Symmetry: C3
Subunit: 118 residues, 3 copies
C-alpha cells in the first residue's frame, strides 16, 4: 500500500483539476501497485517556502510498505515523480522535494484491523 501527500502553495484554482486521481495512477505505476492500493492527498493554497523561497512549489511525501527503503529504489521513484509533477504543476525541478517513508503492515489500519492480519 502507498500513501502520497502533496502540499502546495498554488491556489486550488491553479492546480490542474483531478491531479489527485492522476497522481494516484502515476504512483501505482511507479511504485508497482494496483490503483486500488494507492492513496493520494493534495493540500493546495498553503503558505510555503521551499529551499528558502516562497515562489510556487510543492512538497511530496510517499509512504509505503516495501518499496521506498533504499537509495536505489528512491532515486528511481524520484526521477519519475519529478517528471510527472514538474509537467503537471508547471514547476521547475528546483521547486519540488520528496520525502520517502517506509511503513510496516502493523502500522496500517484497514477495515477495523491492521494489515498484519489481512
Amino acid at each position: 500500500m502507498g500513501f502520497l501527500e502533496l502540499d502546495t502553495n498554488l491556489p486550488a484554482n491553479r492546480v490542474p483539476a483531478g491531479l489527485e486521481k492522476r497522481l494516484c495512477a502515476a504512483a501505482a505505476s511507479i511504485l508497482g501497485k494496483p490503483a486500488d492500493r494507492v492513496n493520494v492527498t493534495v493540500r493546495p493554497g498553503l503558505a510555503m517556502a521551499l529551499s528558502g523561497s516562497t515562489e510556487p512549489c510543492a512538497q511530496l511525501s510517499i509512504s509505503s510498505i516495501g518499496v521506498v527503503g533504499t537509495a536505489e529504489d528512491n532515486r528511481s521513484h524520484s526521477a519519475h515523480f519529478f517528471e510527472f509533477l514538474t509537467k503537471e504543476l508547471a514547476l521547475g525541478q528546483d521547486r519540488i522535494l520528496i520525502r520517502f517513508f517506509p511503513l510496516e503492515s502493523w502500522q496500517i489500519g484497514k477495515i477495523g484491523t491492521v494489515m498484519t492480519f489481512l
Copy 2:
C-alpha cells in the same frame, strides 16, 4: 501523549461540527490517556483518492509515545477508531485508513524543552 491528524475530502460544512473535540475524547479513551494529553488536527476540503477512488474518504494518522507499536495494540485501536469515524463521517469502512507511528520522549517539544526532561 497522542497526536491525531485527519485529512478528508468532505467539505468543511459536511464534517459534523466539533469533530476535533469528540475525536480527542475518543482517542483519550481508546489510547488510554487523559484528554489533556491528546491532540487532534482535522483538515477538510482536500482533494483525495483513497484506494484509488475519489469518493468521500478520510485518512487518520495516530502518533504516540508507547501504545501504538505492535500489531496487537493497533488492531484494537483500529477497531475502535473505525467504529467512531465511520459513524461520525457517514463513511463505509472501505473509505478510511489509519497509519500508526510510535514516538519517543526526545522527539516531543513541550514548554520549550522536550518530554525527556519533564
Copy 3:
C-alpha cells in the same frame, strides 16, 4: 536539509503575513543551515485540539538530516522555536507542541534523484 510543517487553528487572516518566510529564516539559524536548505509549510484555518483544548494553538513538526536526533539537541531547538512562535502567534507556551523527526539522505528526493547521490 530541514522541513517544517505548522498546523494552526488560527484563521489565515490571523496568522501574521509572511510567517512561512520568517520561520524559514529562524529555522535556518536554529538548526544551523543556510536559508536555501530550509523548507516551511503553514496550514491555517484547521480544526484543532491541543492538550484537549480547542483554544488557539499550533503544532510544529521539524524533520531534518542530522540535527534532531537527541534529547539534548531537541531541547535546545525547542527553546528557540517556542520563543519564536509564541511571540509571532501571540500564543502561550501551553498552546504549541513540536515533533522532531530525523531523516536520512536516501529518503529525500531532490532534482530527480535522492540526496545520497548529490
